Amino acid sequence: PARSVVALKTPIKVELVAGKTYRWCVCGRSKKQPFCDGSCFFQRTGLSPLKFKAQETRMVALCTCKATQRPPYCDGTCRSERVQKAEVGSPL
Ligand code: FES
Ligand code: FES
């Protein structure tokens, strides 16, 4: 598939709703971060979003740099110098 790209360099906090299905953007191209807007498909990247169903209602931080080791969640990899020096829209 295409390489993923860094969409942003800070996570987005979202209130997840128990029982609701979400589609995390894995490719970095969505203009509705942190979730998929179909860009993965329209641009024929070969990538597709990480579908997940929230088990509890709570605030979470979803990854926008797309380099987390625990997708879909922010694990602080964005805090590395590698990500903070990256250019948005480019691969890490
Ligand atoms: S827009 Fe990125 S995974 Fe769909
Ligand atoms: S935004 Fe990607 S690890 Fe924090």
Q: How was this structure determined?
A: X-ray
User: How far apart (Å, rounded) are the C-alpha atoms in residues 67 and 58?
Assistant: 23
Domain ranges in the chain are 1-92
Output the residue whose Cα is nearest ligand 2's atom 4.
74
Cβ atoms of 64 and 8 closer than 8 Å: yes
86 lines ligand 2 (CB under 6 A): no
- The CA distances from residue 51 to 22, 29, 54, 72, in Å, are 6, 16, 10, 9
37 CB burial (10 A radius; 0-12, 13-18, 19+): middle
Q: Per the omega criterion (within 30 degrees of 0), is the bond before 49 cis?
A: no
| d(CA 41, ligand 2 centre) in Å | 23
Query: What stretch of H or E contains 84?
Result: helix 81-84
Cβ atoms of 67 and 83 closer than 8 Å: yes
Q: Using alpha carbons, select from 65, 62, 70 the residue that is nearest to residue 83.
A: 65
Resolution in A: 1.9
Show Cβ contacts of residue 53 under 8 Å, excluding neighbours closer than 6 positions.
19, 20, 21, 22
User: How far apart (Å, rounded) are the C-alpha atoms in residues 89 and 33?
Assistant: 13
| d(CA 20, ligand 2 centre) in Å | 22
5 lines ligand 1 (CB under 6 A): no
Strand partners, 50: 24
